[PDB]
Amino acid sequence: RHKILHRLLQ
Amino acid sequence: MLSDEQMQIINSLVEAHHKTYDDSYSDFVRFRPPVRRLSMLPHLADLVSYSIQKVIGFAKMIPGFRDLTAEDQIALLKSSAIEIIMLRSNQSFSLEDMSWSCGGPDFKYCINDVTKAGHTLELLEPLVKFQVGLKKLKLHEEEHVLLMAICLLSPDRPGVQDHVRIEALQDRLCDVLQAYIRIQHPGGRLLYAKMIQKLADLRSLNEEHSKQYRSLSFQPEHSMQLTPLVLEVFGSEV
Ligand SMILES: C=C1/C(=C\C=C2/CCC[C@]3(C)C(C4(CCCC(C)(C)O)CC4)=CC[C@@H]23)C[C@@H](O)C[C@@H]1O
């Protein structure tokens, strides 16, 4: 989960 | 006086903030326009969402935050995001109008506007008082950017597992903030204490917002107006 957060954290 | 490592931190934080905060507010034209039931929710949800991306940009540039585990970075950002946004918004807050003036008139939000986003005075009354007490401190750029990093790097958040490492980080930042005021802020004899109090105020504001967002997101006709990033960050998923 937290799909976008992982992305935005490189 | 201040050491090279401490002013090295200050340099990083200030630049981090300069990348992630755009004084021209020109990106605002791309949000869903403000309208003035719950007419301001789309513009404001787009507003918050954009701010979350800025805070994540800033966070990644705080020395050490990057080297944290990805769970910890998530946990810090999830619990502290509404607080950092409330902090960074102080840059756009005017004591003349008692409102956030972001360039143009359609990007000027008063209390009444934010009620048209599903929020009550039980939150807006303490928030705008908080913005006023915060503006009266006349913080330096360095002091403002340190407090955002101190607020974000709090180990006493739900979810955090490396409580030691984050308290270490947060500590070194307070040493810098304490030594900066002592040496670079005339009349700052009490400023650090009242900056610490503003943190305690942010916990109350967080709490009140958390309550009022829960009701907002339990009604699909309103949560459908939010953005995926807002729902992820303010979501209770673990
Ligand atoms: C964003 C920001 C700005 C303002 C912040 C505001 C103004 C309106 C009210 C806001 C959005 C709130 C509310 C509404 C929250 C709405 C929702 C997320 C749907 O529950 C809590 C009053 C908290 C911070 C406030 C503009 C600029 O300073 C960048 C900053 O980064």
Author numbering:
A (entry chain B2): 687 to 696
B (entry chain A2): 155 to 190, 251 to 452
Task: Please quote the paper that reports this structure.
The activities of 1,25D3 are mediated by its binding to the Vitamin D Receptor (VDR, also termed NR1I1), a ligand-dependent transcription factor that belongs to the nuclear receptor superfamily. The 1,25D3 plays a key role in calcium homeostasis by promoting VDR activities in the intestines, bones and kidneys, and is involved in a wide spectrum of biological pathways, including cell differentiation and immune responses. The VDR/RXR heterodimers bind to genomic locations, known as vitamin D response elements (VDRE), within the regulatory regions of their target genes to modulate gene transcription in concert with various co-regulatory molecules. In the present study, by solving the crystal structure of wild type (WT)- and VDRgem-bound to BXL-62, we identify the mechanisms underlying the high potency of the C-20-modified analogs to induce the transcriptional activities of VDR.
To investigate the structural modifications induced by the addition of 16-ene and C-20 cyclopropyl moieties to the 1,25D3 backbone, we determined the crystal structure of the zebrafish (z) VDR LBD in complex with BXL-62. The protein was crystallized in the presence of an excess of BXL-62, and of the human NCoA1 peptide encompassing the second nuclear receptor LXXLL-interacting motif. The structure was solved by molecular replacement and refined to 2.7 Å. BXL-62 adopted a similar orientation in the LBP as 1,25D3, and the BXL-62-bound VDR had the canonical VDR-agonist conformation. Even though the 16-ene moiety reduced the flexibility of the skeleton of 1,25D3, the interactions between VDR and the A-, Seco B-, and C/D- rings of BXL-62 were similar to those of 1,25D3. In addition, the hydroxyl group in C1, C3, and C25 of BXL-62 and of 1,25D3 formed a similar interaction with zSer265 and zArg302, with zTyr175 and zSer306, and with zHis333 and zHis423, respectively. Moreover, all of the contacts identified between zVDR and the 1,25D3 lateral side chain were conserved in the zVDR-BXL-62 complex, as well as the additional interactions with the residues of H6 (zVal328), loop (L) 6–7(zHis333), H7 (zLeu338, zLeu341), and H11 (zHis423) that were formed in the presence of BXL-62. These contacts were induced by the positioning of the side chain, as shown by the torsion angles of C16-C17-C20-C22 (−130° for BXL-62 and -29° for 1,25D3) imposed by the 16-ene configuration and the C-20 cyclopropyl group of BXL-62, resulting in the cyclopropyl pointing towards H7. In addition, the distances between the C25 geminal methyl groups and the C-terminal residues zLeu440 (loop 11–12) and zPhe448 (H12) were reduced in the presence of BXL-62 than in the presence of 1,25D3. Thus, the increased rigidity imposed by the geometry of the 16-ene configuration and of the C-20 cyclopropyl group, as well as the stronger/additional interactions, contribute to a more stable VDR agonist conformation.
